[PDB]
From a paper:
The cryptophycins (Cps) are a class of macrocyclic depsipeptide natural products derived from species of marine cyanobacteria in the genus Nostoc. Cps destabilize microtubules, thereby preventing correct mitotic spindle formation and inhibiting cell proliferation. At high concentrations, Cp-1 and Cp-52 destabilize microtubules and cause the formation of curved tubulin complexes and rings. Cp-1 and Cp-52 bind primarily to a site on β-tubulin that overlaps with, but is distinct from, that of maytansine as well as those of rhizoxin and PM060184.
Cp-52 induces tubulin to form rings consisting of eight tubulin heterodimers. The cryo-EM reconstruction shows that Cp-52 is bound at the interdimer site, immediately adjacent to the contact region between β-tubulin and α-tubulin, and oriented with unit A toward the right, unit B toward the left, and units C and D toward the viewer, when the ring is viewed from the outside as shown (or when a microtubule protofilament is viewed from the luminal side with the plus-end up). The phenyl group of unit A and the isobutyl group of unit D are exposed, whereas the aromatic ring of unit B is in a deep pocket between β-tubulin and α-tubulin. The aromatic ring on unit B forms a pi–pi T-interaction with β:F394. Cp-52 unit B fits into a pocket on α-tubulin formed by the C-terminal end of α:H8, the N-terminal end of α:B8, and the strand between α:H10 and α:B9. The aromatic ring on unit B makes contacts with α:A314 and α:C347, whereas the methoxy group engages in alkyl interactions with α:P261, α:M313, and α:W346. We have found that Cp-52 binding induces tubulin to form rings with an interdimer angle of 35.6° and an intradimer angle of 12.1°. Relative to three microtubule reference structures, α:H8 in Cp-52-bound tubulin is rotated an average of 23.4° clockwise, as viewed toward the protofilament plus-end. This reorientation accommodates the binding of Cp-52 between β-tubulin and α-tubulin. There are also conformational differences between Cp-1-bound and Cp-52-bound tubulin in that α:H10 of the latter is shifted out of register, relative to the former, by 2.4 Å (i.e., half a turn) toward the exterior of the protofilament.
Residue numbers in the entry:
A (entry chain A): 1 to 436
B (entry chain D): 1 to 430
Write the structure that this text describes.
């Protein structure tokens, strides 16, 4: 009874979406030929899985998402991958030439000649909706397509739909899988023009995902199928709230309300704990108290920043299977050991919990195996300023001697944009640092 | 990607690029008859980068060869893989192109620029989208330097959007019969700095130095050095030719590499130095590749980078290889040489890995750097020019051919300013 639309931009976005949509199939029992025996095959739905699949009279359960790429190299792969028959006759978006690591080329030159088609597609999809909450866009700060076009898309959407919210999932690109060197300019130039049209954005750092996969997954060569699968698992876990059924954090509005205090501070940090290694059959057993104890370890968060230096806003949680709220209360009492915990004086505290009575789903033939309990703490820390400071150092270095600047100026951008965005990010990091 | 148009100028260009076509055509496993021999799709994933289908869906290289000395056509059609090309772009002159500028730059050649634009547009009609251009030439003689700069400017006018890349060969006193070279070299690089996007300094001085002091060949011929350069430029092209993780492209290579708006002269290098062999080889393994990648006597510019700084770096490794090991040694090399590299762009030393071995060697790589050491080469060329110029010499040829003294003076002003720019960016701080 509340529709939802997602959208994928860029190679990273489309790959993550590929890795996520089949997880989404698995979770509800949806299968490329599945039928979910409790339905009428004609709109049989309006449950929490209706928000994505707008199932047709053919009992197909077609989704609500489109994929964007300036030059077909991954969107084709999903067009001829595994769930081929799962998408409409050329509903997807294919271009002819990428922005090539150039924020400007996607922000002023190329996208400004393809965007109208994207908006037409988004509107045409939304018309079939009835109660849309907002958009969930997938992009990255690395390239110029998944960044310049994303910011331009933000502007266009906020122009056409300002009332509705639109949650974001982003990647803070790492030197380890750095496919460019002009990422930091794109990152600043995207965060600066994101705030005024953003509401709540999640960053998942490929530094962090790479570290997790290399360390606790026994993989030394993280292709774009390993890190991609891990991130898909995290995204499914976070959106399970609205996805499976009703509990804490039903709606995107509710995301904002219980997460974001201050519209300049809307980058929640997500932690996880169950990192099942591999097909390893037997290591030991597991306890809910154990995983909630682990969800405080700095090594197990989706973005590298040590929060024992700062204060939290609102530390929500989710769980899968084996309800035991008394154990949860004991867990809060234990973590109250105040060795690495804090809250903020002005507003009281709430560790809202919502339980899903389904054990977590796993990739069948992947680098994981099925477990029974799961949990994901979305702690809106003040420590998330570490990432911005780290990226500011590099942006300042590169802008010291005006490196690469021509590749942006000579395409429809001015010189003052760089300076003003740097100042704006300085104000933003000041706005984080002052809270306390 | 989109298609690439290749342009070949003069005797040096025709010979060097014909050998390069042979090298890659063996690498992509295509027969002289256009017959297909490759045994996997990974060979033809990016065959459309260069080669175009025939009426028999037979893949044909797309390139153009330009010169005015009409004796080159038979040289084209007498190589081992020479007859491979389309019998439509063997367009050449008819009365020689004596190594004088403004003869191919102003006097003639300017009459056949219509012909060359006609042929390049004709074969880019069959190109669904255009990526860039490959002009191979040298900095001495009309056909060569002068035609190259004229072509560069013309296509820059007609296609201001796409990329423009070229290979530069700088003639040297060590192997050079004529002596009107330094004038040609400076007159060339003046057009080249302001009119192209990136360029490779395939030098002869360093080439001869290393070939005679380690490879120790008696008579460096147009055979041996042609082989060396064809191999190295094949190695450079591999990254686009291969599918890579550092899945770089011409525009992407420019964006990643290009540090300033006038410093786009690269220093192609190669770690496992190779002569004309017969058997498989004497074996080489990883740490040897690591060391010989960045030695002092393996590049193509007579400079020691430890006397300068890198703006950026790039490599493309070859053969079955341990990626984690490679990353480990690269991290060490960026760790144990802190002062060696510029502090302006961290995360500059990019790395990629390829799979198909070179057709003859097991484990190799391809170094495509961008240093501040290139000022030594440019200073050398400019000093020899001005030594030839302080008193006039053959300059009556140029003046009566169309230039004036002011063009020479401004070419030197531009080159010395460029050297000042490289010096400046070579002495930055934090
Ligand atoms: C001080 O007196 C000296 C005299 C000679 C030498 C070395 C002497 N010099 C040169 O000519 C070198 C460059 C001058 C250019 C001049 C500057 C270009 O405009 C030329 C031109 C070409 C065609 C038509 C009109 C004009 O000429 C040439 O390249 C011509 C090629 C042509 C004529 C086939 O000749 C040769 O290429 C040679 C003679 C085989 C090359 N060899 C030499 O041992 C050294 C000194 Cl120091
Ligand atoms: N899918 C995926 N992408 C990643 C990962 N790590 C980094 N990336 C990013 O993937 C991006 C490639 O897509 P884009 O950023 O859109 O690249 P582009 O040059 O703008 O355009 P395309 O290459 O056509 O997509 C780079 O910016 C990388 O930083 C990863 O683990 N998975
Ligand atoms: N043919 C040839 N010439 C080379 C090579 N390397 C350097 N050169 C030099 O390039 C110059 C030849 O210029 P060229 O293109 O013949 O001028 P043109 O007479 O106008 O065609 C000579 O100085 C050669 O020494 C090579 O591999 N092949």
């Amino acid at each position: 009874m509340r529709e939802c639309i997602s959208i994928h931009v860029g190679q990273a976005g489309v790959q993550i979406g590929n890795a996520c949509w089949e997880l989404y199939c698995l979770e509800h029992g949806i299968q490329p030929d599945g039928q979910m025996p409790s339905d009428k095959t004609i709109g049989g739905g309006d449950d929490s899985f209706n928000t994505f699949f707008s199932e047709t009279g053919a009992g197909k359960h077609v989704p609500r998402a489109v994929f964007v790429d300036l030059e077909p190299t991954v969107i084709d792969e999903v067009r001829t991958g595994t769930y081929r028959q799962l998408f409409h006759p050329e509903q997807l978006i294919t271009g002819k030439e990428d922005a090539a690591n150039n924020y400007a080329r996607g922000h002023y030159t190329i996208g400004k000649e393809i965007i109208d088609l994207v908006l037409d597609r988004i509107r045409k999809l939304a018309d079939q909706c009835t109660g849309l909450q907002g958009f969930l866009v997938f992009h990255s700060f690395g390239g110029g397509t998944g960044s310049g076009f994303t910011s331009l898309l933000m502007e266009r959407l906020s122009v056409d739909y300002g009332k509705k919210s639109k949650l974001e999932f982003s990647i803070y690109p790492a030197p380890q899988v750095s496919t460019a060197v002009v990422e930091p300019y794109n990152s600043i130039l995207t965060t600066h023009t994101t705030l005024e049209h953003s509401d709540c954005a999640f960053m998942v750092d490929n530094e962090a995902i790479y570290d997790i996969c290399r360390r606790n997954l026994d993989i030394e060569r993280p292709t774009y199928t390993n890190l991609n699968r891990l991130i898909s698992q995290i995204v499914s876990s976070i959106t399970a709230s609205l996805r499976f059924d009703g509990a804490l954090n039903v709606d995107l509005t509710e995301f904002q309300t219980n997460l974001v205090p201050y519209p300049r501070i809307h980058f929640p940090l997500a932690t996880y704990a169950p990192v099942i290694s591999a097909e390893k059959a037997y290591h030991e057993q597991l306890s809910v108290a154990e995983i909630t104890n682990a969800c405080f370890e700095p090594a197990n968060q989706m973005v590298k920043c040590d929060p024992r230096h700062g204060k939290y806003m609102a530390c929500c949680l989710l769980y899968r299977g084996d309800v035991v709220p008394k154990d949860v209360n004991a867990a809060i009492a234990t973590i109250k050991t105040k060795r690495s915990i804090q809250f903020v004086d002005w507003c009281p505290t709430g560790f809202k919990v919502g339980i899903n009575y389904q054990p977590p789903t796993v990739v069948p033939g992947g680098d994981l195996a099925k477990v029974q309990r799961a949990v994901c703490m979305l702690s809106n820390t003040t420590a998330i300023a570490e990432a911005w400071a780290r990226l500011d150092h590099k942006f300042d270095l590169m802008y010291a001697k005006r490196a690469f600047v021509h590749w942006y100026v000579g395409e429809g951008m001015e010189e003052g944009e760089f300076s003003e965005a740097r100042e704006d990010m300085a104000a933003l990091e000041k706005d984080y640092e002052e809270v306390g | 990607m989109r298609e690439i148009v290749h342009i070949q100028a003069g005797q040096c260009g025709n010979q060097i690029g014909a050998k390069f076509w042979e090298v890659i055509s063996d690498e992509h496993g295509i027969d002289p008859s256009g017959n297909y021999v490759g045994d996997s799709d990974l060979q033809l994933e990016r065959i459309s980068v260069y080669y175009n289908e025939a009426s028999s869906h037979k893949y044909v290289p797309r390139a153009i060869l330009v010169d005015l000395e009409p004796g080159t056509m038979d040289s084209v059609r007498s190589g081992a893989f020479g007859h491979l090309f389309r019998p439509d772009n063997f367009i050449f002159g008819q009365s020689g192109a004596g190594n004088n500028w403004a003869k191919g730059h102003y006097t003639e050649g300017a009459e056949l620029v219509d012909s060359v634009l006609d042929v390049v547009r004709k074969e880019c009609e069959n190109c669904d989208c255009l990526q860039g251009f490959q002009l191979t030439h040298s900095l001495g003689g009309g056909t060569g330097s002068g035609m190259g700069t004229l072509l560069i400017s013309k296509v820059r006018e007609e296609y201001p959007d796409r990329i423009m890349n070229t290979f530069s060969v700088v003639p040297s006193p060590k192997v050079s019969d004529t002596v009107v070279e330094p004038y040609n070299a400076t007159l060339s690089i003046h057009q080249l700095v302001e009119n192209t996007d990136e360029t490779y300094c395939i030098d002869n001085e360093a080439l001869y130095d290393i070939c005679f002091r380690t490879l120790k060949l008696a008579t460096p011929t147009y055979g041996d050095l042609n082989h060396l350069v064809s191999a190295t430029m094949s190695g450079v092209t591999t990254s686009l030719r291969f599918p890579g993780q550092l899945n770089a492209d011409l525009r992407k290579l420019a964006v990643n590499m290009v540090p300033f708006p006038r410093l786009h002269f690269f220093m192609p290098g190669f770690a496992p130095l190779t002569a004309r062999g017969s058997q498989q080889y004497r074996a080489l393994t990883v740490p040897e590749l690591t060391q010989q990648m960045f030695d002092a006597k393996n590049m193509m510019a007579a400079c020691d980078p430890r006397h300068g700084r890198y703006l950026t770096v790039a490599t493309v490794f070859r053969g079955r290889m341990s990626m984690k090991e490679v990353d480990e040694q690269m991290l060490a090399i960026q760790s144990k040489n802190s002062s060696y590299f510029v502090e302006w762009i961290p995360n500059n030393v990019k790395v990629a890995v390829c799979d198909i071995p070179p057709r003859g060697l097991k484990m190799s790589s391809t170094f495509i750097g961008n240093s501040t050491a290139i000022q030594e080469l440019f200073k050398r060329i400019s000093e020899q020019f001005t030594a030839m110029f302080r008193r006039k010499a053959f300059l009556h040829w140029y003046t009566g051919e169309g230039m004036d003294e002011m063009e020479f003076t401004e070419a030197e002003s531009n080159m010395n300013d460029l050297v000042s720019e490289y010096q400046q960016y070579q002495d930055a701080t934090a």
